[PDB]
């Protein structure tokens with residue numbers, strides 16, 4: 343929404359997000375990077391976008407050369423809020439309903455994970471790797487790569503899982519090792535949040 | 546230089562960093578991990594087809610070719626990093642009179658140029674590069690140019706003179722989220738003798 347604010351996380355960022363993220367990695371990501379997106383969004387939006395949800399702001403400003411700055415900050419605020427709800431200490435096991443949807447689409451959970459890591463590894467520069475529901479294709483699950491502030495809402499996709507591949511997301515704990523970050527992140531994924539987003543996306 | 550690519554010899558020992566701004570680890574990751582991976586991937590995608598060609602040739606032959614975007618990315622990044630690593634040296638090198646004069650005539654002063662270059666770097670969204678180029682199509686005037694991802698000014702017909710990497714990996718080890726501090730401090734390590742040589746040759 344607007345005036346936007348840094349959301350409360352499901353866990354204490356001061357303890358990191360064990361076993362994959364250190365307190366420093368979480369501190370920089372949330373209190374520096376996400377907070378800057380929130381502040382800049384509030385500054386570029388002012389009072390103009392009041393009452394609108396962040397999704398509505400994103401859709402109103404997407405592909406508008408005069409409001410690219412606002413698109414970048416609004417989309418990054420949505421993207422980080424989504425990503426920070428996708429992680430939790432020690433993760434949460436995948437509920438049956440989501441495991442079933444992932445298995446039917448990708449052949450297995452391990453085939454999905456391998457396909458998602460490949461997409462993340464090959465997402466050139468700053469970006470995001472997503473698992474979305476495609477309402478224009480029988481609510482099927484699709485892996486989607488976005489560049490910079492790119493947001494799948496602009497494509498009509500319904501996000502269910504977001505993984506940040508901007509270097510700041512992993513540089514403190516993994517340095518140049520984006521493949522290791524992608525392989526290890528599975529240990530902290532809150533699959534109960536993903537299943538909730540999946541269940542809501544299919545109506 | 547040419548294909549098959551190799552990591553360029555640096556003017557300094559990366560094991561000592563690049564004092565007073567870069568630690569040995571920041572240099573180690575940037576050159577031996579990031580730059581090396583661009584070299585290896587370029588050599589893999591170029592194969593035998595681009596053997597014996599210069600890096601500039603590969604960048605231009607493959608630019609604006611959707612089927613060879615992978616090759617463009619690796620070839621442009623190898624050029625960009627080779628240029629950047631030649632722009633830095635421990636304690637820097639003072640600006641020669643000929644370049645100081647060209648910078649002063651264009652930007653009003655050296656200080657005004659630096660402030661303008663920092664603003665461009667700070668506002669270069671996502672992964673990118675901030676350049677000082679000579680524009681041969683405009684009376685050899687100096688211009689500040691921002692490129693995104695692997696973006697290379699050679700494709701615009703610009704003649705690079707200074708490259709500053711703004712991909713987060715260029716500064717994350719020593720400056721974390723503080724891209725403005727990295728940009729303000731980098732001036733202390735710039736090899737202005739190399740820049741003046743590039744300027745003089747660019748005409």
Ligand SMILES: [Fe+3]
Pocket residue numbers: 371375422506508510511
């Ligand atoms: Fe991020």
Ligand SMILES: [Fe+3]
Pocket residue numbers: 575579626710712714715
């Ligand atoms: Fe770099």
